[PDB]
Symmetry: C2
Subunit: 122 residues, 2 copies
């Protein structure tokens, strides 16, 4: 129970259009983590269907470059950089590269979970 | 409010020996996330000082390859994969590459914080 390794390539995946999504529910972590998580990969020139949800979402780009449209704003997020989406903000994630796959790790959580956590730190 | 980005290269840094650590305390996120976070980078042929803490720690390998020693056992975690350290497991992170920098994004939380979170969604 000391450490677990999680592999983007060997995990079970589903496809949203052509985006490969690896959801962490498959790993049966239960409540050990105060959030849910996934990897997703976007083919070159592709983009995610518009997404909107009460959970905040923190994303780290582990390969390629993301162009994230939130409202009337495009944010460019290169490999290594991160972005945080506030609750219920609609968003589209775009891979404008012609040859490089965009892969992202996302953690996401309901606002109540985060405030319940921090009050325990009090 | 809607959307924030975070930059690995320009974030404020401190050094633990020769490891560059970018702590997310500097972004003033307060209570929005149910965990703390950081990037750290390990130079080639270097390793972290032995670390042990009550927080669980989820680490994504953003660049390079990690060799994680937990207790007596070495685990290799290539680019893009994740590892999860259980509470109070002593760990050392080595970069055995001759030339490629290892960069890791880590999120960490106390067990009580994850208990208090999920009991709020009950
Ligand atoms: Ni989303
Ligand atoms: Ni640690």
């Amino acid at each position: 129970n000391a450490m677990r390794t999680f592999d983007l390539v060997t995990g079970e995946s589903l496809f949203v259009n052509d985006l490969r999504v690896v959801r962490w529910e498959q790993y049966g972590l239960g409540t050990a983590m105060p959030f849910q998580a996934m990897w997703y990969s976007v083919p070159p020139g592709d983009e995610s269907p518009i997404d909107q949800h009460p959970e905040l979402e923190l994303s780290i780009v582990v390969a390629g470059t993301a162009h994230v449209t939130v409202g009337d704003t495009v944010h460019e997020v290169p490999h290594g950089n991160a972005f945080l989406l506030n609750s219920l903000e609609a968003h589209v994630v775009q891979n404008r590269s012609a040859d490089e796959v965009l892969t992202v790790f996302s953690a996401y959580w309901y606002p109540e979970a985060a405030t319940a956590a921090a009050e325990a730190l009090a």
